[PDB]
Structure 1
Amino acid sequence: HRIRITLTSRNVKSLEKVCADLIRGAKEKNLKVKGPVRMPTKTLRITTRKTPCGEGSKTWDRFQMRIHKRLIDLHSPSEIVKQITSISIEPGVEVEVTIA
């Protein structure tokens, strides 16, 4: 009944498109839905030396990865959940469907 899907991604545009597409599917099937809740973004940050050897001006990079997690709540049987989730998913977004 109280299904809860979680969408992790590295991109922002694709993830907003996926979650908006899923709530459009839930609106078309006319379901009560909780809005797309945004978790705070994770910024994986690695600071390495640019130089392979040791000499130079001490120059550092700032490589960062961003992880965006948006999650949705729906109220439907499992068949509806499988039918909506099995369609329309962008290749970069990773999905986790929890039940309770």
Structure 2
Amino acid sequence: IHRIRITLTSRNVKSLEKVCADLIRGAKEKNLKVKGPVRMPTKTLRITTRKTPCGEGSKTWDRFQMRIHKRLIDLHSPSEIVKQITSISIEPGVEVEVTIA
């Protein structure tokens, strides 16, 4: 089968959407039937940390939250074409997992 799946994950929604638009245009630059970007639920990671290094004062905490936004682009094409589209200076912080089955 030639259905190549890009599991692309990044911390920024705007950079993620720019990557997705560029990738889907590069697919749209060629003759490749594609599906729309599939947005899996963003992982919200919570870390609640006491602020004072030594326990003193009012009970105060910081709440660091990590938003991880993940799109999938599965296109009906050999992975070589997708790699040809890939060399476009991918946005930093956007990681790509390649799925071939």
- Considering the TM-score relative to the shorter chain, is it more than 0.5? yes
TM-score range, shorter chain: over 0.9
Once the 2 structures are TM-superposed, how far is the Cα of residue 84 of structure 1 from its aligned partner? 1.2
Q: When the two structures are superposed, what TM-score results if normalisation uses the length of structure 1?
A: 0.94
* Counterpart for residue 3 of structure 2: 2
Contact 2:5/2:100, CA 8 A, preserved across alignment: yes
Paired residue total: 100
> How far apart, CA to CA, are the structure 2 residues paired with 1:64 and 1:78?
35
Once the 2 structures are TM-superposed, how far is the Cα of residue 30 of structure 1 from its aligned partner? 2.4
Counterparts of 1:2-81 in structure 2, within 5 Å, are 2-81=3-82
Q: What secondary structure is seen at the aligned counterpart in 1 of 2:21?
A: helix
> How far apart, CA to CA, are the structure 1 residues paired with 2:8 and 2:79?
18
| Cα RMSD, aligned residues only | 1.0
> How far apart, CA to CA, are the structure 1 residues paired with 2:84 and 2:19?
15
Q: Deviations over 1:1-35 (max 9, x none)?
A: 11111101011110000011100011110211110
Once the 2 structures are TM-superposed, how far is the Cα of residue 57 of structure 1 from its aligned partner? 0.5
Q: Deviations over 1:17-75 (max 9, x none)?
A: 00111000111102111100101010111001111111101011111111001010111
Contact 1:18/1:88, CA 8 A, preserved across alignment: no
Q: Which ranges in structure 1 are unaligned for 5 or more consecutive residues?
A: none
Q: What secondary structure is seen at the aligned counterpart in 1 of 2:62?
A: coil
Once the 2 structures are TM-superposed, how far is the Cα of residue 78 of structure 1 from its aligned partner? 2.5
Calculate percent identity across the aligned residue pairs: 100
Runs of 4+ in 1 over 6 A off after TM superposition: none
Q: Which ranges in structure 2 are unaligned for 5 or more consecutive residues?
A: none
* Counterpart for residue 85 of structure 1: 86
Q: What secondary structure is seen at the aligned counterpart in 2 of 1:24?
A: helix
Q: When the two structures are superposed, what TM-score results if normalisation uses the length of structure 2?
A: 0.93
